[PDB]
Amino acid sequence: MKYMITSKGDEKSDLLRLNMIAGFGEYDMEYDDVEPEIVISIGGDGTFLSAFHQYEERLDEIAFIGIHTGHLGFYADWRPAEADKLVKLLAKGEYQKVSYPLLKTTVKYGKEATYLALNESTVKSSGGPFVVDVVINDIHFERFRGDGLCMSTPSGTTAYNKSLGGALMHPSIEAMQLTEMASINNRVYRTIGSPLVFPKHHVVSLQPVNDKDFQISVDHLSILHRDVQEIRYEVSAKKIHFARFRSFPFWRRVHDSFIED
Amino acid sequence: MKYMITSKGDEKSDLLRLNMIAGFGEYDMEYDDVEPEIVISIGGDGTFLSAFHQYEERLDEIAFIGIHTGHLGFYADWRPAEADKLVKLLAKGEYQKVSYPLLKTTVKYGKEATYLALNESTVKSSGGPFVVDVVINDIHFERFRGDGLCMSTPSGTTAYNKSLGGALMHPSIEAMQLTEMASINNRVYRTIGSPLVFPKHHVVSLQPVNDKDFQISVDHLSILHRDVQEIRYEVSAKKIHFARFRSFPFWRRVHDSFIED
Amino acid sequence: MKYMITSKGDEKSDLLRLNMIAGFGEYDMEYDDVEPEIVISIGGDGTFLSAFHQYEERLDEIAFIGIHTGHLGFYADWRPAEADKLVKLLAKGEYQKVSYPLLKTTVKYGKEATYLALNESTVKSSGGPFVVDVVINDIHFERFRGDGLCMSTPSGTTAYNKSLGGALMHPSIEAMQLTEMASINNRVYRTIGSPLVFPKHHVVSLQPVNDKDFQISVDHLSILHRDVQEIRYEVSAKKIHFARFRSFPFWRRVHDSFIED
Amino acid sequence: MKYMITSKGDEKSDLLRLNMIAGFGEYDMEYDDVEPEIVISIGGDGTFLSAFHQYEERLDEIAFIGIHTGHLGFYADWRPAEADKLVKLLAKGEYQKVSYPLLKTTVKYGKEATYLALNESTVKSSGGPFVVDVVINDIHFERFRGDGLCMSTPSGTTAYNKSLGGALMHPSIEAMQLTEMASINNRVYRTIGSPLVFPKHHVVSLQPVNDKDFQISVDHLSILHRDVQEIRYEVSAKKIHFARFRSFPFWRRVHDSFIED
């Protein structure tokens, strides 16, 4: 079918890309980066992340695969030595697919901007103090004062979420996790401190109290948003689809990354 | 129908119990503590916890209700002032029911002991060092050295799990969360550190490496188990059922308990 | 002697300032904000902080006093009701003095910039990834990857240091404390994680590895430094001097701020 | 002079001990384990710890040395390959000495028991809930509810203190550090959460509120104390003295243990 391959840019990934294309030519496979049904990433997790956001409007028609030319990645979890065997099974197809949940971020002004995050979305102030009111399902939960907040996807918990004390949750759980950055707590300012895991259809809303300028990141993308009235977080109805070739469990992927390999 | 009421034991809860029984007599309600269909707890969360374990063999036939004669509880979340209104709606029934997941703990020796936990189950050593191998779905994940481990239900995350840095997760998420107690980490001994959230059907297994004596707790119950070969944790197929009378959201219950009320 | 009074700017602090000046006129006291021997701050801790940095070149000749017109402060720890009694004892003098250690920050380029911090000094990247090599007494200790680092004075531990997990240490201990911001740790990148308390004469040096642009803060001041070769942290030889009128222990000041009051 | 050598018990340490004794016989050195002036530990940190407590009544007349026959230790910080060179310099003496602060623990009943801790002293309940009032310099600071508390020496911060989130402080700082174990915090029960570093002459006192039975540990020693009225913590006036042969900085010892070696 139609496919395309993105490369990190170094000669290790570029040469590995040219070989897979040459191997794909031996099969009924057409190269198309406009309407691909298979998107192959070669490099690391950031390369897969750019490949995800490059085609985040055709997610239901794409099965992603990641190849790590460096250290192991949670998305690029196939070594370069399996590139030739990957070409054959992708060519004749018949592969199983696995789907991970995604995070929807809605930014409201005085239009409306919506984003799709594979890892996480963070909110920080524009330099001044970061104070925000946290509203969970139209219920005022807390007034957060600190460095910022991070809402993470299940697969994104192994990234920035983990550095903030958040829990690692299996990606089959359709949920999102909110963690704090350097919250100030005294007798007068109260935050929950613990990470918060939210199921599907739960809407977490950040609302300003003073400054309406915030630095909002979505995976690698980061923009300074001005005159914002609300930031809405919820589990997205769309899912990223992977091509599954063999058993590489998420917990084994966690063990190899943080324990030993 | 058949009902029964447990009391904390103080005169505040005993008198509140006698009044609800007198009010129940004005309706088609029979008092039965052998086969009750309604179990009312009056006191706090520990009173509800003892009421849960007293009838943990008829969970599919019971709708629990908790009344807090002291501070607010996550299970006893109805004030004493609503006792009379609670009697009327329970009498004519028609109430909706909500179900929370439970934790199954299997202890294997050289028979087999299984427990049901509403909050959490902890494992500590018998005084000596606590070293254990953590196996996730038959995959050796880590060798844990420290004070102990805690596997928490979703509703149990607000209890001992929260004191260990674990995340608070909404009880509609059928999952369990594992947290560490004072793990020792150097270049030679590696633990994940982060809490781990496991979905349904995932089996987390603790296996000894030296001492086979461990102090295992299940909610309030705590026993010294000797000559144990394995501790199996997984989300239980059974659920505790509550009687629902009005909207008291879990996140509002979290806000009232830790933020302010 | 010579004195001056800074005000937060609100009418509560301005009127309290005009009254103390009028009360000071009843004594042998001259108002001088060029060479003051007594510096009175009226407002909060940020007002005292601006008053400290306004006169950080005559620290050995000044005894500072802080008055909080709002909530209690660790530097402005005297209520407005004690302003009149404060005027009398300052006028005839005979007051005891207490001294807190300070933090010296040296920034080396390709000249040299030195700063004095009463609370803390933080280092973050200019937007990109923050990677830095931590050198303790000319010994390479770790390569830090994360959001940034914070070196705190003893009295500064109750501020941003506390939000990062650092310990609160009594200000009589001439030392400094280093804490991490969202460090990334795996099998390949290793940080200590724990806070580090350094005694006097110990030099902690941050050295770039890639980007040489960092956002460095010193108390409230924050500047983007470009083409930096080294950031040197050490306990300063200079001390801030307070005027002591009665027993307000630091631990009682910690209790009143975070436990209850 | 007079010396003695303790061994871990394995054949690696016993044979290394017999060789140093044979090498000591070539010099003006007498073996005496009653009144030794040099105490050599061969094994790990627990072997040095037992050697410390074996002679904790002649601390001012002993210079300790630790040899690690296994992984590196913070007290046994000399490899077995340096045993012969260690024998020669100890024999002719002229070595410099370094001193680390110690922790004094006073347990008051209805007599009085005092202990000396090289690493830390912990307090836990006897099985029931652990609630205690924390009094700092006769000022009620907090009511602690949780698993327990740990007061650590400076050199002890790399041990159990580190697993509880406490800071690592250089041993030249005469101080002690208090850390919490799984404290419960809500709107009604308030603990500081942060670790607390106390200078010399500051007295931290734990006082019961209900149960007067606590499991108190002092380094490796652990005893169940009954009918206790007070636990007093303070920096001891006595110091443990080491024999210094070359530069092995504490921070390098921290780097080798937790970063890499």
Ligand SMILES: CC(=O)SCCCCn1cnc2c(N)ncnc21
């Ligand atoms: C410095 C930080 O805290 S973000 C590190 C990002 C590394 C690349 N990466 C991208 N996605 C992931 C992921 N899901 N899990 C771990 N690492 C990931």
Ligand SMILES: CC(=O)SCCCCn1cnc2c(N)ncnc21
């Ligand atoms: C000292 C500790 O860490 S356990 C405190 C237990 C208080 C009673 N309780 C019982 N169940 C719960 C619950 N689910 N959420 C919060 N509190 C609960």
Ligand SMILES: CC(=O)SCCCCn1cnc2c(N)ncnc21
């Ligand atoms: C949002 C943060 O983490 S910084 C809060 C700073 C409040 C004012 N202040 C200034 N100095 C201090 C101090 N030493 N101790 C506590 N608070 C202080």
Ligand SMILES: CC(=O)SCCCCn1cnc2c(N)ncnc21
């Ligand atoms: C499982 C724990 O948290 S205690 C581990 C004790 C290891 C031996 N040891 C004894 N003293 C020390 C010390 N000062 N620094 C590190 N390790 C030490």
